[PDB]
PDB file of all heavy atoms in Angstrom:
ATOM      1  N   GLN A 101       0.830  -1.174   0.011  1.00 54.34           N
ATOM      2  CA  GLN A 101      -0.014  -0.010  -0.002  1.00 54.34           C
ATOM      3  C   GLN A 101       0.891   1.248  -0.012  1.00 54.34           C
ATOM      4  O   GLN A 101       2.017   1.216   0.512  1.00 54.34           O
ATOM      5  CB  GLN A 101      -0.935   0.069   1.250  1.00 54.34           C
ATOM      6  CG  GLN A 101      -1.945  -1.069   1.264  1.00 54.34           C
ATOM      7  CD  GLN A 101      -2.756  -0.931   2.566  1.00 54.34           C
ATOM      8  OE1 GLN A 101      -3.166   0.165   2.928  1.00 54.34           O
ATOM      9  NE2 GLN A 101      -3.048  -2.048   3.244  1.00 54.34           N
ATOM     10  N   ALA A 102       0.379   2.329  -0.602  1.00 54.65           N
ATOM     11  CA  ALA A 102       1.118   3.574  -0.678  1.00 54.65           C
ATOM     12  C   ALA A 102       1.118   4.184   0.720  1.00 54.65           C
ATOM     13  O   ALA A 102       0.150   3.923   1.484  1.00 54.65           O
ATOM     14  CB  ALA A 102       0.551   4.565  -1.681  1.00 54.65           C
ATOM     15  N   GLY A 103       2.116   5.015   0.988  1.00 56.95           N
ATOM     16  CA  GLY A 103       2.165   5.674   2.266  1.00 56.95           C
ATOM     17  C   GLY A 103       1.347   6.916   2.190  1.00 56.95           C
ATOM     18  O   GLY A 103       0.563   7.149   1.271  1.00 56.95           O
ATOM     19  N   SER A 104       1.522   7.819   3.170  1.00 57.98           N
ATOM     20  CA  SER A 104       0.763   9.079   3.223  1.00 57.98           C
ATOM     21  C   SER A 104       1.503  10.127   2.425  1.00 57.98           C
ATOM     22  O   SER A 104       1.120  11.265   2.434  1.00 57.98           O
ATOM     23  CB  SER A 104       0.518   9.594   4.629  1.00 57.98           C
ATOM     24  OG  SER A 104       1.729   9.872   5.306  1.00 57.98           O
ATOM     25  N   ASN A 105       2.569   9.708   1.761  1.00 59.53           N
ATOM     26  CA  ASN A 105       3.387  10.642   0.982  1.00 59.53           C
ATOM     27  C   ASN A 105       2.902  10.634  -0.385  1.00 59.53           C
ATOM     28  O   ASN A 105       3.487  11.252  -1.326  1.00 59.53           O
ATOM     29  CB  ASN A 105       4.873  10.298   0.974  1.00 59.53           C
ATOM     30  CG  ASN A 105       5.468  10.351   2.383  1.00 59.53           C
ATOM     31  OD1 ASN A 105       5.958   9.301   2.885  1.00 59.53           O
ATOM     32  ND2 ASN A 105       5.416  11.503   3.056  1.00 59.53           N
ATOM     33  N   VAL A 106       1.809   9.896  -0.684  1.00 56.60           N
ATOM     34  CA  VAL A 106       1.245   9.855  -2.043  1.00 56.60           C
ATOM     35  C   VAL A 106      -0.159  10.436  -1.944  1.00 56.60           C
ATOM     36  O   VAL A 106      -0.971   9.928  -1.152  1.00 56.60           O
ATOM     37  CB  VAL A 106       1.146   8.470  -2.582  1.00 56.60           C
ATOM     38  CG1 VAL A 106       0.480   8.525  -3.998  1.00 56.60           C
ATOM     39  CG2 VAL A 106       2.565   7.856  -2.638  1.00 56.60           C
ATOM     40  N   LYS A 107      -0.432  11.448  -2.749  1.00 59.43           N
ATOM     41  CA  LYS A 107      -1.734  12.047  -2.779  1.00 59.43           C
ATOM     42  C   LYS A 107      -2.644  11.009  -3.423  1.00 59.43           C
ATOM     43  O   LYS A 107      -2.308  10.282  -4.286  1.00 59.43           O
ATOM     44  CB  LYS A 107      -1.723  13.287  -3.683  1.00 59.43           C
ATOM     45  CG  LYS A 107      -2.841  14.211  -3.333  1.00 59.43           C
ATOM     46  CD  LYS A 107      -2.597  14.891  -2.027  1.00 59.43           C
ATOM     47  CE  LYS A 107      -3.645  15.957  -1.667  1.00 59.43           C
ATOM     48  NZ  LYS A 107      -3.373  16.557  -0.373  1.00 59.43           N
ATOM     49  N   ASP A 108      -3.895  11.006  -2.879  1.00 59.61           N
ATOM     50  CA  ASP A 108      -4.875  10.062  -3.369  1.00 59.61           C
ATOM     51  C   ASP A 108      -5.204  10.354  -4.829  1.00 59.61           C
ATOM     52  O   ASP A 108      -5.649   9.463  -5.554  1.00 59.61           O
ATOM     53  CB  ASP A 108      -6.222  10.106  -2.613  1.00 59.61           C
ATOM     54  CG  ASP A 108      -6.093   9.569  -1.195  1.00 59.61           C
ATOM     55  OD1 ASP A 108      -5.094   8.833  -0.868  1.00 59.61           O
ATOM     56  OD2 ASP A 108      -6.979   9.838  -0.362  1.00 59.61           O
ATOM     57  N   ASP A 109      -4.948  11.627  -5.223  1.00 55.57           N
ATOM     58  CA  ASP A 109      -5.244  11.999  -6.612  1.00 55.57           C
ATOM     59  C   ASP A 109      -4.048  11.709  -7.479  1.00 55.57           C
ATOM     60  O   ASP A 109      -4.122  11.903  -8.668  1.00 55.57           O
ATOM     61  CB  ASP A 109      -5.656  13.441  -6.757  1.00 55.57           C
ATOM     62  CG  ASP A 109      -6.953  13.785  -6.105  1.00 55.57           C
ATOM     63  OD1 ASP A 109      -7.783  12.797  -5.843  1.00 55.57           O
ATOM     64  OD2 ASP A 109      -7.276  14.976  -5.903  1.00 55.57           O
ATOM     65  N   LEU A 110      -2.936  11.307  -6.864  1.00 55.06           N
ATOM     66  CA  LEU A 110      -1.737  11.006  -7.593  1.00 55.06           C
ATOM     67  C   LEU A 110      -1.457   9.548  -7.374  1.00 55.06           C
ATOM     68  O   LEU A 110      -0.407   9.035  -7.773  1.00 55.06           O
ATOM     69  CB  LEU A 110      -0.499  11.831  -7.131  1.00 55.06           C
ATOM     70  CG  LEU A 110      -0.730  13.344  -7.292  1.00 55.06           C
ATOM     71  CD1 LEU A 110       0.461  14.114  -6.682  1.00 55.06           C
ATOM     72  CD2 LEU A 110      -0.908  13.711  -8.734  1.00 55.06           C
ATOM     73  N   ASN A 111      -2.428   8.855  -6.825  1.00 54.26           N
ATOM     74  CA  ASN A 111      -2.300   7.440  -6.560  1.00 54.26           C
ATOM     75  C   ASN A 111      -2.974   6.715  -7.663  1.00 54.26           C
ATOM     76  O   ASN A 111      -4.098   7.076  -8.025  1.00 54.26           O
ATOM     77  CB  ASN A 111      -2.848   6.972  -5.224  1.00 54.26           C
ATOM     78  CG  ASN A 111      -2.166   5.689  -4.717  1.00 54.26           C
ATOM     79  OD1 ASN A 111      -1.771   4.843  -5.515  1.00 54.26           O
ATOM     80  ND2 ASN A 111      -2.024   5.589  -3.351  1.00 54.26           N
ATOM     81  N   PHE A 112      -2.381   5.624  -8.157  1.00 53.31           N
ATOM     82  CA  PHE A 112      -2.947   4.815  -9.183  1.00 53.31           C
ATOM     83  C   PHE A 112      -3.741   3.751  -8.622  1.00 53.31           C
ATOM     84  O   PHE A 112      -4.431   3.030  -9.247  1.00 53.31           O
ATOM     85  CB  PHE A 112      -1.872   4.144 -10.117  1.00 53.31           C
ATOM     86  CG  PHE A 112      -1.031   5.205 -10.826  1.00 53.31           C
ATOM     87  CD1 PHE A 112       0.303   5.357 -10.392  1.00 53.31           C
ATOM     88  CD2 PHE A 112      -1.529   5.989 -11.861  1.00 53.31           C
ATOM     89  CE1 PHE A 112       1.086   6.247 -11.099  1.00 53.31           C
ATOM     90  CE2 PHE A 112      -0.725   6.896 -12.479  1.00 53.31           C
ATOM     91  CZ  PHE A 112       0.604   7.055 -12.084  1.00 53.31           C
ATOM     92  N   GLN A 113      -3.664   3.563  -7.245  1.00 53.60           N
ATOM     93  CA  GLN A 113      -4.399   2.550  -6.581  1.00 53.60           C
ATOM     94  C   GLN A 113      -5.827   3.018  -6.356  1.00 53.60           C
ATOM     95  O   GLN A 113      -6.671   2.227  -5.957  1.00 53.60           O
ATOM     96  CB  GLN A 113      -3.750   2.191  -5.172  1.00 53.60           C
ATOM     97  CG  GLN A 113      -2.357   1.557  -5.321  1.00 53.60           C
ATOM     98  CD  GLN A 113      -1.675   1.685  -3.999  1.00 53.60           C
ATOM     99  OE1 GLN A 113      -2.190   2.199  -3.011  1.00 53.60           O
ATOM    100  NE2 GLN A 113      -0.382   1.199  -3.950  1.00 53.60           N
ATOM    101  N   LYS A 114      -6.076   4.268  -6.683  1.00 52.60           N
ATOM    102  CA  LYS A 114      -7.375   4.839  -6.510  1.00 52.60           C
ATOM    103  C   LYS A 114      -8.240   4.400  -7.675  1.00 52.60           C
ATOM    104  O   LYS A 114      -7.844   4.523  -8.848  1.00 52.60           O
ATOM    105  CB  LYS A 114      -7.425   6.402  -6.461  1.00 52.60           C
ATOM    106  CG  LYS A 114      -8.796   6.977  -6.193  1.00 52.60           C
ATOM    107  CD  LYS A 114      -8.816   8.493  -6.127  1.00 52.60           C
ATOM    108  CE  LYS A 114     -10.173   9.073  -5.885  1.00 52.60           C
ATOM    109  NZ  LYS A 114     -10.103  10.527  -5.801  1.00 52.60           N
ATOM    110  N   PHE A 115      -9.453   3.792  -7.359  1.00 53.24           N
ATOM    111  CA  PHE A 115     -10.335   3.339  -8.445  1.00 53.24           C
ATOM    112  C   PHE A 115     -11.623   4.034  -8.287  1.00 53.24           C
ATOM    113  O   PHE A 115     -12.023   4.433  -7.161  1.00 53.24           O
ATOM    114  CB  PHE A 115     -10.553   1.832  -8.346  1.00 53.24           C
ATOM    115  CG  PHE A 115      -9.354   0.954  -8.606  1.00 53.24           C
ATOM    116  CD1 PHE A 115      -8.607   0.562  -7.558  1.00 53.24           C
ATOM    117  CD2 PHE A 115      -9.021   0.660  -9.908  1.00 53.24           C
ATOM    118  CE1 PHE A 115      -7.440  -0.247  -7.770  1.00 53.24           C
ATOM    119  CE2 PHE A 115      -7.835  -0.144 -10.117  1.00 53.24           C
ATOM    120  CZ  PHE A 115      -7.113  -0.560  -9.098  1.00 53.24           C
ATOM    121  N   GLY A 116     -12.403   4.124  -9.373  1.00 54.14           N
ATOM    122  CA  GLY A 116     -13.653   4.750  -9.361  1.00 54.14           C
ATOM    123  C   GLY A 116     -14.665   3.699  -9.714  1.00 54.14           C
ATOM    124  O   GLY A 116     -14.403   2.776 -10.410  1.00 54.14           O
ATOM    125  N   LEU A 117     -15.975   3.921  -9.239  1.00 52.34           N
ATOM    126  CA  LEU A 117     -16.976   2.910  -9.522  1.00 52.34           C
ATOM    127  C   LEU A 117     -18.176   3.686  -9.976  1.00 52.34           C
ATOM    128  O   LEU A 117     -18.649   4.591  -9.366  1.00 52.34           O
ATOM    129  CB  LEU A 117     -17.363   2.127  -8.258  1.00 52.34           C
ATOM    130  CG  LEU A 117     -18.651   1.272  -8.461  1.00 52.34           C
ATOM    131  CD1 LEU A 117     -18.468  -0.155  -7.914  1.00 52.34           C
ATOM    132  CD2 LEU A 117     -19.911   1.903  -7.825  1.00 52.34           C
ATOM    133  N   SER A 118     -18.698   3.278 -11.182  1.00 54.40           N
ATOM    134  CA  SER A 118     -19.853   3.887 -11.737  1.00 54.40           C
ATOM    135  C   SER A 118     -21.035   3.082 -11.246  1.00 54.40           C
ATOM    136  O   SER A 118     -20.933   1.968 -10.885  1.00 54.40           O
ATOM    137  CB  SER A 118     -19.897   3.983 -13.266  1.00 54.40           C
ATOM    138  OG  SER A 118     -19.896   2.668 -13.812  1.00 54.40           O
ATOM    139  N   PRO A 119     -22.242   3.724 -11.275  1.00 58.21           N
ATOM    140  CA  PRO A 119     -23.491   3.089 -10.904  1.00 58.21           C
ATOM    141  C   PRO A 119     -23.794   1.866 -11.707  1.00 58.21           C
ATOM    142  O   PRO A 119     -24.570   1.033 -11.319  1.00 58.21           O
ATOM    143  CB  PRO A 119     -24.587   4.156 -11.042  1.00 58.21           C
ATOM    144  CG  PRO A 119     -23.816   5.444 -11.027  1.00 58.21           C
ATOM    145  CD  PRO A 119     -22.462   5.167 -11.659  1.00 58.21           C
ATOM    146  N   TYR A 120     -23.205   1.827 -12.907  1.00 57.91           N
ATOM    147  CA  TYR A 120     -23.427   0.730 -13.806  1.00 57.91           C
ATOM    148  C   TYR A 120     -22.673  -0.500 -13.329  1.00 57.91           C
ATOM    149  O   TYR A 120     -22.934  -1.608 -13.805  1.00 57.91           O
ATOM    150  CB  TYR A 120     -23.015   0.991 -15.255  1.00 57.91           C
ATOM    151  CG  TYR A 120     -23.772   2.093 -15.902  1.00 57.91           C
ATOM    152  CD1 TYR A 120     -23.285   3.389 -15.882  1.00 57.91           C
ATOM    153  CD2 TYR A 120     -24.987   1.816 -16.552  1.00 57.91           C
ATOM    154  CE1 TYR A 120     -24.016   4.382 -16.502  1.00 57.91           C
ATOM    155  CE2 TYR A 120     -25.670   2.867 -17.164  1.00 57.91           C
ATOM    156  CZ  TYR A 120     -25.194   4.163 -17.147  1.00 57.91           C
ATOM    157  OH  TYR A 120     -25.948   5.186 -17.762  1.00 57.91           O
ATOM    158  N   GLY A 121     -21.777  -0.307 -12.400  1.00 58.48           N
ATOM    159  CA  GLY A 121     -21.008  -1.388 -11.842  1.00 58.48           C
ATOM    160  C   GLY A 121     -19.649  -1.548 -12.581  1.00 58.48           C
ATOM    161  O   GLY A 121     -18.943  -2.458 -12.365  1.00 58.48           O
ATOM    162  N   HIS A 122     -19.312  -0.512 -13.459  1.00 54.38           N
ATOM    163  CA  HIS A 122     -18.081  -0.581 -14.122  1.00 54.38           C
ATOM    164  C   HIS A 122     -17.073  -0.021 -13.211  1.00 54.38           C
ATOM    165  O   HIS A 122     -17.266   0.974 -12.536  1.00 54.38           O
ATOM    166  CB  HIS A 122     -18.071   0.198 -15.428  1.00 54.38           C
ATOM    167  CG  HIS A 122     -18.865  -0.363 -16.548  1.00 54.38           C
ATOM    168  ND1 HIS A 122     -20.237  -0.172 -16.582  1.00 54.38           N
ATOM    169  CD2 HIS A 122     -18.555  -1.176 -17.631  1.00 54.38           C
ATOM    170  CE1 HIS A 122     -20.691  -0.775 -17.659  1.00 54.38           C
ATOM    171  NE2 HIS A 122     -19.644  -1.406 -18.306  1.00 54.38           N
ATOM    172  N   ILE A 123     -15.846  -0.666 -13.233  1.00 57.59           N
ATOM    173  CA  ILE A 123     -14.750  -0.208 -12.371  1.00 57.59           C
ATOM    174  C   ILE A 123     -13.718   0.354 -13.272  1.00 57.59           C
ATOM    175  O   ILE A 123     -13.233  -0.308 -14.209  1.00 57.59           O
ATOM    176  CB  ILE A 123     -14.126  -1.356 -11.619  1.00 57.59           C
ATOM    177  CG1 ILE A 123     -15.200  -2.039 -10.727  1.00 57.59           C
ATOM    178  CG2 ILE A 123     -12.972  -0.816 -10.756  1.00 57.59           C
ATOM    179  CD1 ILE A 123     -14.673  -3.348 -10.103  1.00 57.59           C
ATOM    180  N   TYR A 124     -13.310   1.638 -13.000  1.00 58.04           N
ATOM    181  CA  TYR A 124     -12.330   2.302 -13.836  1.00 58.04           C
ATOM    182  C   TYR A 124     -11.392   2.972 -12.935  1.00 58.04           C
ATOM    183  O   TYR A 124     -11.576   2.982 -11.705  1.00 58.04           O
ATOM    184  CB  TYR A 124     -12.899   3.362 -14.812  1.00 58.04           C
ATOM    185  CG  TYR A 124     -14.091   4.085 -14.254  1.00 58.04           C
ATOM    186  CD1 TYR A 124     -13.950   5.016 -13.231  1.00 58.04           C
ATOM    187  CD2 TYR A 124     -15.385   3.830 -14.720  1.00 58.04           C
ATOM    188  CE1 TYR A 124     -15.050   5.699 -12.721  1.00 58.04           C
ATOM    189  CE2 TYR A 124     -16.456   4.526 -14.238  1.00 58.04           C
ATOM    190  CZ  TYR A 124     -16.306   5.413 -13.254  1.00 58.04           C
ATOM    191  OH  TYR A 124     -17.434   6.109 -12.723  1.00 58.04           O
ATOM    192  N   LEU A 125     -10.356   3.583 -13.493  1.00 59.46           N
ATOM    193  CA  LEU A 125      -9.394   4.286 -12.601  1.00 59.46           C
ATOM    194  C   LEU A 125      -9.982   5.650 -12.409  1.00 59.46           C
ATOM    195  O   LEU A 125     -10.623   6.204 -13.299  1.00 59.46           O
ATOM    196  CB  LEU A 125      -7.986   4.458 -13.265  1.00 59.46           C
ATOM    197  CG  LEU A 125      -7.518   3.250 -14.042  1.00 59.46           C
ATOM    198  CD1 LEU A 125      -6.036   3.471 -14.456  1.00 59.46           C
ATOM    199  CD2 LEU A 125      -7.713   1.969 -13.256  1.00 59.46           C
ATOM    200  N   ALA A 126      -9.719   6.219 -11.263  1.00 58.65           N
ATOM    201  CA  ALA A 126     -10.231   7.573 -10.955  1.00 58.65           C
ATOM    202  C   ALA A 126      -9.456   8.513 -11.770  1.00 58.65           C
ATOM    203  O   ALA A 126      -9.978   9.633 -12.029  1.00 58.65           O
ATOM    204  CB  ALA A 126     -10.093   7.922  -9.469  1.00 58.65           C
ATOM    205  N   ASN A 127      -8.217   8.210 -12.199  1.00 62.75           N
ATOM    206  CA  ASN A 127      -7.452   9.187 -12.952  1.00 62.75           C
ATOM    207  C   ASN A 127      -7.463   8.847 -14.401  1.00 62.75           C
ATOM    208  O   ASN A 127      -7.205   9.697 -15.250  1.00 62.75           O
ATOM    209  CB  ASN A 127      -5.934   9.212 -12.505  1.00 62.75           C
ATOM    210  CG  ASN A 127      -5.801   9.622 -11.037  1.00 62.75           C
ATOM    211  OD1 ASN A 127      -6.466  10.571 -10.569  1.00 62.75           O
ATOM    212  ND2 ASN A 127      -4.982   8.886 -10.231  1.00 62.75           N
ATOM    213  N   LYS A 128      -7.829   7.628 -14.769  1.00 60.44           N
ATOM    214  CA  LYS A 128      -7.872   7.190 -16.139  1.00 60.44           C
ATOM    215  C   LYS A 128      -9.146   6.440 -16.293  1.00 60.44           C
ATOM    216  O   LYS A 128      -9.182   5.196 -16.255  1.00 60.44           O
ATOM    217  CB  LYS A 128      -6.684   6.250 -16.543  1.00 60.44           C
ATOM    218  CG  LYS A 128      -5.704   7.024 -17.446  1.00 60.44           C
ATOM    219  CD  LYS A 128      -4.597   7.747 -16.676  1.00 60.44           C
ATOM    220  CE  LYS A 128      -3.786   8.678 -17.559  1.00 60.44           C
ATOM    221  NZ  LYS A 128      -2.982   7.873 -18.537  1.00 60.44           N
ATOM    222  N   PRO A 129     -10.198   7.163 -16.516  1.00 61.06           N
ATOM    223  CA  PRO A 129     -11.541   6.560 -16.718  1.00 61.06           C
ATOM    224  C   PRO A 129     -11.653   5.787 -17.996  1.00 61.06           C
ATOM    225  O   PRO A 129     -12.657   5.106 -18.165  1.00 61.06           O
ATOM    226  CB  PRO A 129     -12.474   7.750 -16.712  1.00 61.06           C
ATOM    227  CG  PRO A 129     -11.668   8.908 -16.108  1.00 61.06           C
ATOM    228  CD  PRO A 129     -10.233   8.611 -16.578  1.00 61.06           C
ATOM    229  N   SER A 130     -10.616   5.862 -18.824  1.00 58.99           N
ATOM    230  CA  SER A 130     -10.673   5.139 -20.097  1.00 58.99           C
ATOM    231  C   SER A 130     -10.199   3.758 -19.860  1.00 58.99           C
ATOM    232  O   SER A 130     -10.397   2.841 -20.617  1.00 58.99           O
ATOM    233  CB  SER A 130      -9.851   5.809 -21.218  1.00 58.99           C
ATOM    234  OG  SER A 130      -8.494   5.859 -20.845  1.00 58.99           O
ATOM    235  N   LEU A 131      -9.515   3.552 -18.677  1.00 61.47           N
ATOM    236  CA  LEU A 131      -8.959   2.271 -18.387  1.00 61.47           C
ATOM    237  C   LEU A 131      -9.865   1.647 -17.357  1.00 61.47           C
ATOM    238  O   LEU A 131     -10.227   2.268 -16.350  1.00 61.47           O
ATOM    239  CB  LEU A 131      -7.563   2.308 -17.746  1.00 61.47           C
ATOM    240  CG  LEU A 131      -6.414   2.246 -18.779  1.00 61.47           C
ATOM    241  CD1 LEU A 131      -6.271   3.612 -19.461  1.00 61.47           C
ATOM    242  CD2 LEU A 131      -5.077   1.823 -18.173  1.00 61.47           C
ATOM    243  N   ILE A 132     -10.299   0.341 -17.640  1.00 61.27           N
ATOM    244  CA  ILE A 132     -11.141  -0.334 -16.762  1.00 61.27           C
ATOM    245  C   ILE A 132     -10.614  -1.719 -16.540  1.00 61.27           C
ATOM    246  O   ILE A 132      -9.704  -2.148 -17.242  1.00 61.27           O
ATOM    247  CB  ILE A 132     -12.565  -0.450 -17.276  1.00 61.27           C
ATOM    248  CG1 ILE A 132     -12.601  -1.036 -18.671  1.00 61.27           C
ATOM    249  CG2 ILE A 132     -13.213   0.939 -17.220  1.00 61.27           C
ATOM    250  CD1 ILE A 132     -13.999  -1.331 -19.168  1.00 61.27           C
ATOM    251  N   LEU A 133     -11.175  -2.422 -15.524  1.00 63.29           N
ATOM    252  CA  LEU A 133     -10.655  -3.756 -15.253  1.00 63.29           C
ATOM    253  C   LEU A 133     -11.318  -4.682 -16.193  1.00 63.29           C
ATOM    254  O   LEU A 133     -12.539  -4.564 -16.475  1.00 63.29           O
ATOM    255  CB  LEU A 133     -11.019  -4.215 -13.831  1.00 63.29           C
ATOM    256  CG  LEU A 133     -10.443  -3.289 -12.785  1.00 63.29           C
ATOM    257  CD1 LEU A 133     -10.864  -3.761 -11.349  1.00 63.29           C
ATOM    258  CD2 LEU A 133      -8.925  -3.179 -12.874  1.00 63.29           C
ATOM    259  N   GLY A 134     -10.594  -5.625 -16.738  1.00 64.33           N
ATOM    260  CA  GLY A 134     -11.105  -6.559 -17.722  1.00 64.33           C
ATOM    261  C   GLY A 134     -10.220  -7.817 -17.704  1.00 64.33           C
ATOM    262  O   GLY A 134      -9.222  -7.807 -17.025  1.00 64.33           O
ATOM    263  N   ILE A 135     -10.601  -8.830 -18.486  1.00 62.85           N
ATOM    264  CA  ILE A 135      -9.833 -10.068 -18.535  1.00 62.85           C
ATOM    265  C   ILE A 135      -9.630 -10.425 -19.956  1.00 62.85           C
ATOM    266  O   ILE A 135     -10.375  -9.920 -20.841  1.00 62.85           O
ATOM    267  CB  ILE A 135     -10.517 -11.243 -17.825  1.00 62.85           C
ATOM    268  CG1 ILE A 135     -12.001 -11.279 -18.118  1.00 62.85           C
ATOM    269  CG2 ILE A 135     -10.226 -11.103 -16.314  1.00 62.85           C
ATOM    270  CD1 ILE A 135     -12.317 -12.087 -19.373  1.00 62.85           C
ATOM    271  N   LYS A 136      -8.616 -11.238 -20.259  1.00 61.57           N
ATOM    272  CA  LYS A 136      -8.370 -11.644 -21.615  1.00 61.57           C
ATOM    273  C   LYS A 136      -8.450 -13.145 -21.596  1.00 61.57           C
ATOM    274  O   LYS A 136      -8.102 -13.776 -20.648  1.00 61.57           O
ATOM    275  CB  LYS A 136      -6.967 -11.247 -22.103  1.00 61.57           C
ATOM    276  CG  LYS A 136      -6.760 -11.600 -23.582  1.00 61.57           C
ATOM    277  CD  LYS A 136      -5.436 -11.130 -24.098  1.00 61.57           C
ATOM    278  CE  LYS A 136      -5.221 -11.500 -25.597  1.00 61.57           C
ATOM    279  NZ  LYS A 136      -3.900 -11.032 -26.058  1.00 61.57           N
ATOM    280  N   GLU A 137      -8.915 -13.702 -22.760  1.00 58.54           N
ATOM    281  CA  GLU A 137      -9.031 -15.099 -22.857  1.00 58.54           C
ATOM    282  C   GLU A 137      -7.688 -15.778 -22.881  1.00 58.54           C
ATOM    283  O   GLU A 137      -6.680 -15.091 -23.273  1.00 58.54           O
ATOM    284  CB  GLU A 137      -9.808 -15.580 -24.145  1.00 58.54           C
ATOM    285  CG  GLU A 137      -9.076 -15.202 -25.400  1.00 58.54           C
ATOM    286  CD  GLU A 137      -9.939 -15.608 -26.604  1.00 58.54           C
ATOM    287  OE1 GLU A 137     -11.036 -16.149 -26.431  1.00 58.54           O
ATOM    288  OE2 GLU A 137      -9.452 -15.416 -27.800  1.00 58.54           O
ATOM    289  N   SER A 138      -7.586 -17.030 -22.506  1.00 60.07           N
ATOM    290  CA  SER A 138      -6.332 -17.741 -22.491  1.00 60.07           C
ATOM    291  C   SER A 138      -6.284 -18.594 -23.692  1.00 60.07           C
ATOM    292  O   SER A 138      -7.347 -18.866 -24.315  1.00 60.07           O
ATOM    293  CB  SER A 138      -6.084 -18.603 -21.236  1.00 60.07           C
ATOM    294  OG  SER A 138      -4.809 -19.150 -21.238  1.00 60.07           O
ATOM    295  N   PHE A 139      -5.070 -19.118 -24.074  1.00 61.33           N
ATOM    296  CA  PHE A 139      -4.978 -19.957 -25.220  1.00 61.33           C
ATOM    297  C   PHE A 139      -5.725 -21.260 -24.973  1.00 61.33           C
ATOM    298  O   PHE A 139      -6.316 -21.798 -25.885  1.00 61.33           O
ATOM    299  CB  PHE A 139      -3.527 -20.300 -25.551  1.00 61.33           C
ATOM    300  CG  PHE A 139      -2.728 -19.196 -26.097  1.00 61.33           C
ATOM    301  CD1 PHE A 139      -1.967 -18.384 -25.277  1.00 61.33           C
ATOM    302  CD2 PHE A 139      -2.759 -18.872 -27.435  1.00 61.33           C
ATOM    303  CE1 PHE A 139      -1.253 -17.339 -25.762  1.00 61.33           C
ATOM    304  CE2 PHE A 139      -2.004 -17.831 -27.933  1.00 61.33           C
ATOM    305  CZ  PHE A 139      -1.253 -17.062 -27.067  1.00 61.33           C
TER     306      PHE A 139
END
């Protein structure tokens, strides 16, 4: 976990949640959690 020397707005561990249930980054809303198929 990041210490208190990292702003929450400068932290990449910060995630945002939309009402639709989509999970994205609070700083990069274009990036969301997803999975890729395996061979």
Side-chain angles (χ1 to χ4, degrees):
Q101 295 179 42
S104 61
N105 300 118
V106 178
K107 204 68 175 180
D108 290 343
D109 290 345
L110 298 175
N111 204 327
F112 299 107
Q113 293 162 2
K114 184 179 180 180
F115 295 93
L117 169 134
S118 61
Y120 295 94
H122 289 82
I123 301 170
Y124 34 72
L125 321 186
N127 299 315
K128 252 88 190 293
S130 62
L131 270 77
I132 53 171
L133 302 177
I135 42 90
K136 184 178 180 179
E137 65 183 0
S138 183
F139 289 93

